[PDB]
Design a protein around this motif. Structure first.
Motif, PDB file in Angstrom:
ATOM      1  N   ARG A  18       0.823  -1.203   0.000  1.00  0.00           N
ATOM      2  CA  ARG A  18       0.000   0.000   0.000  1.00  0.00           C
ATOM      3  C   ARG A  18       0.860   1.257   0.000  1.00  0.00           C
ATOM      4  O   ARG A  18       0.628   2.180  -0.781  1.00  0.00           O
ATOM      5  CB  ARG A  18      -1.001   0.010   1.146  1.00  0.00           C
ATOM      6  N   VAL A  19       1.854   1.287   0.881  1.00  0.00           N
ATOM      7  CA  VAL A  19       2.785   2.408   0.948  1.00  0.00           C
ATOM      8  C   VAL A  19       3.449   2.653  -0.401  1.00  0.00           C
ATOM      9  O   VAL A  19       3.479   3.782  -0.892  1.00  0.00           O
ATOM     10  CB  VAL A  19       3.875   2.174   2.011  1.00  0.00           C
ATOM     11  N   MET A  20       3.982   1.592  -0.995  1.00  0.00           N
ATOM     12  CA  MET A  20       4.634   1.687  -2.295  1.00  0.00           C
ATOM     13  C   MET A  20       3.700   2.293  -3.336  1.00  0.00           C
ATOM     14  O   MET A  20       4.078   3.213  -4.062  1.00  0.00           O
ATOM     15  CB  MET A  20       5.108   0.309  -2.751  1.00  0.00           C
ATOM     16  N   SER A  21       2.479   1.772  -3.403  1.00  0.00           N
ATOM     17  CA  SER A  21       1.510   2.218  -4.396  1.00  0.00           C
ATOM     18  C   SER A  21       1.119   3.672  -4.170  1.00  0.00           C
ATOM     19  O   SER A  21       0.900   4.421  -5.122  1.00  0.00           O
ATOM     20  CB  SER A  21       0.282   1.330  -4.362  1.00  0.00           C
ATOM     21  N   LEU A  24       3.814   5.816  -5.503  1.00  0.00           N
ATOM     22  CA  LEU A  24       3.703   5.878  -6.956  1.00  0.00           C
ATOM     23  C   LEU A  24       2.476   6.675  -7.380  1.00  0.00           C
ATOM     24  O   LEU A  24       2.429   7.219  -8.484  1.00  0.00           O
ATOM     25  CB  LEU A  24       3.649   4.463  -7.545  1.00  0.00           C
ATOM     26  N   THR A  25       1.485   6.739  -6.499  1.00  0.00           N
ATOM     27  CA  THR A  25       0.311   7.575  -6.724  1.00  0.00           C
ATOM     28  C   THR A  25       0.665   9.054  -6.646  1.00  0.00           C
ATOM     29  O   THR A  25       0.319   9.833  -7.534  1.00  0.00           O
ATOM     30  CB  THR A  25      -0.805   7.270  -5.707  1.00  0.00           C
ATOM     31  N   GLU A  26       1.355   9.436  -5.577  1.00  0.00           N
ATOM     32  CA  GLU A  26       1.691  10.836  -5.342  1.00  0.00           C
ATOM     33  C   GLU A  26       2.729  11.329  -6.342  1.00  0.00           C
ATOM     34  O   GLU A  26       2.576  12.398  -6.934  1.00  0.00           O
ATOM     35  CB  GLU A  26       2.204  11.030  -3.913  1.00  0.00           C
ATOM     36  N   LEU A  27       3.785  10.544  -6.527  1.00  0.00           N
ATOM     37  CA  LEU A  27       4.877  10.925  -7.415  1.00  0.00           C
ATOM     38  C   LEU A  27       4.934  10.021  -8.639  1.00  0.00           C
ATOM     39  O   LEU A  27       4.777   8.804  -8.531  1.00  0.00           O
ATOM     40  CB  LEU A  27       6.211  10.886  -6.659  1.00  0.00           C
ATOM     41  N   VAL A  28       5.160  10.622  -9.802  1.00  0.00           N
ATOM     42  CA  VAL A  28       5.278   9.867 -11.044  1.00  0.00           C
ATOM     43  C   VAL A  28       6.455   8.903 -10.991  1.00  0.00           C
ATOM     44  O   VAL A  28       7.571   9.287 -10.639  1.00  0.00           O
ATOM     45  CB  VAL A  28       5.445  10.800 -12.258  1.00  0.00           C
ATOM     46  N   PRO A  29       6.201   7.647 -11.345  1.00  0.00           N
ATOM     47  CA  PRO A  29       7.195   6.592 -11.195  1.00  0.00           C
ATOM     48  C   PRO A  29       8.502   6.964 -11.884  1.00  0.00           C
ATOM     49  O   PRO A  29       9.586   6.663 -11.384  1.00  0.00           O
ATOM     50  CB  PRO A  29       6.538   5.363 -11.831  1.00  0.00           C
ATOM     51  N   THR A  30       8.392   7.621 -13.034  1.00  0.00           N
ATOM     52  CA  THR A  30       9.559   7.940 -13.848  1.00  0.00           C
ATOM     53  C   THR A  30      10.237   9.215 -13.363  1.00  0.00           C
ATOM     54  O   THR A  30      11.364   9.517 -13.754  1.00  0.00           O
ATOM     55  CB  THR A  30       9.185   8.102 -15.333  1.00  0.00           C
ATOM     56  N   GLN A  31       9.542   9.962 -12.512  1.00  0.00           N
ATOM     57  CA  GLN A  31      10.066  11.219 -11.991  1.00  0.00           C
ATOM     58  C   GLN A  31      10.462  11.085 -10.526  1.00  0.00           C
ATOM     59  O   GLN A  31      11.091  11.979  -9.960  1.00  0.00           O
ATOM     60  CB  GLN A  31       9.031  12.336 -12.146  1.00  0.00           C
ATOM     61  N   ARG A  86      -2.742  -3.096  -7.594  1.00  0.00           N
ATOM     62  CA  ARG A  86      -2.756  -1.638  -7.602  1.00  0.00           C
ATOM     63  C   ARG A  86      -1.350  -1.074  -7.760  1.00  0.00           C
ATOM     64  O   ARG A  86      -1.117  -0.177  -8.570  1.00  0.00           O
ATOM     65  CB  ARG A  86      -3.452  -1.064  -6.376  1.00  0.00           C
ATOM     66  N   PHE A  87      -0.414  -1.605  -6.980  1.00  0.00           N
ATOM     67  CA  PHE A  87       0.990  -1.229  -7.102  1.00  0.00           C
ATOM     68  C   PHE A  87       1.471  -1.361  -8.541  1.00  0.00           C
ATOM     69  O   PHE A  87       2.085  -0.445  -9.088  1.00  0.00           O
ATOM     70  CB  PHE A  87       1.855  -2.084  -6.175  1.00  0.00           C
ATOM     71  N   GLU A  88       1.192  -2.509  -9.150  1.00  0.00           N
ATOM     72  CA  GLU A  88       1.577  -2.756 -10.535  1.00  0.00           C
ATOM     73  C   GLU A  88       0.967  -1.718 -11.469  1.00  0.00           C
ATOM     74  O   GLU A  88       1.640  -1.195 -12.356  1.00  0.00           O
ATOM     75  CB  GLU A  88       1.157  -4.163 -10.964  1.00  0.00           C
ATOM     76  N   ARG A  89      -0.313  -1.426 -11.264  1.00  0.00           N
ATOM     77  CA  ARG A  89      -1.018  -0.454 -12.092  1.00  0.00           C
ATOM     78  C   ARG A  89      -0.319   0.899 -12.071  1.00  0.00           C
ATOM     79  O   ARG A  89      -0.072   1.497 -13.117  1.00  0.00           O
ATOM     80  CB  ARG A  89      -2.485  -0.330 -11.707  1.00  0.00           C
ATOM     81  N   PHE A  90      -0.005   1.377 -10.871  1.00  0.00           N
ATOM     82  CA  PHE A  90       0.630   2.679 -10.708  1.00  0.00           C
ATOM     83  C   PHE A  90       2.047   2.675 -11.270  1.00  0.00           C
ATOM     84  O   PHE A  90       2.471   3.632 -11.918  1.00  0.00           O
ATOM     85  CB  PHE A  90       0.651   3.083  -9.233  1.00  0.00           C
ATOM     86  N   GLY A  93       1.953   2.840 -14.861  1.00  0.00           N
ATOM     87  CA  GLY A  93       1.229   4.024 -15.308  1.00  0.00           C
ATOM     88  C   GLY A  93      -0.042   3.643 -16.056  1.00  0.00           C
ATOM     89  O   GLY A  93      -0.471   4.348 -16.969  1.00  0.00           O
ATOM     90  N   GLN A  94      -0.640   2.523 -15.664  1.00  0.00           N
ATOM     91  CA  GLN A  94      -1.851   2.034 -16.313  1.00  0.00           C
ATOM     92  C   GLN A  94      -3.065   2.191 -15.406  1.00  0.00           C
ATOM     93  O   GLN A  94      -4.181   1.833 -15.780  1.00  0.00           O
ATOM     94  CB  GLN A  94      -1.688   0.564 -16.710  1.00  0.00           C
ATOM     95  N   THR A  95      -2.838   2.728 -14.212  1.00  0.00           N
ATOM     96  CA  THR A  95      -3.920   2.969 -13.264  1.00  0.00           C
ATOM     97  C   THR A  95      -5.050   3.763 -13.907  1.00  0.00           C
ATOM     98  O   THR A  95      -5.851   3.207 -14.605  1.00  0.00           O
ATOM     99  CB  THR A  95      -3.421   3.724 -12.017  1.00  0.00           C
TER     100      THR A  95
END
Length: 95
Positions: A18-21, A24-31, A86-90, A93-95
């Motif tokens: 949950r924390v990880m996701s 990735l929700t708050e900050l862009v994975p690539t950024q 959910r983690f995977e989705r974020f 970037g497919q969320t």
């Protein structure tokens, strides 16, 4: 004993994921910063280890057991599954 261990482990896993996701929700994975990425990796590794511990516990569960307790464990396992997806989705970037 092992049933309570199953619960605890699965809960910890779902929490860490949950924390990880949420990261990735708050900050862009690539950024995300190198620090953020390291934190994500560490959490993922911890989750993996705990998941292995779960897999070590399940075999030790003799049958039959209390339906209530079995349902609790199953629910927590499903929670892990959900949070993982959910983690995977974020992450992708497919969320």
């Amino acid at each position: 004993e092992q049933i309570g261990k199953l619960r605890s482990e699965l809960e910890m896993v779902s929490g860490n994921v949950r924390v990880m996701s949420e990261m990735l929700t708050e900050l862009v994975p690539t950024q995300a910063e190198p620090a953020d990425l390291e934190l994500l990796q560490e959490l993922n590794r911890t989750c993996r280890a705990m998941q292995q511990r779960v897999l070590e516990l399940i075999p030790q569960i003799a049958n039959e057991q209390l339906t209530e307790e079995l349902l609790i464990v199953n629910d927590n396992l499903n929670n892990v599954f959900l949070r993982h997806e959910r983690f995977e989705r974020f992450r992708t970037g497919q969320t």
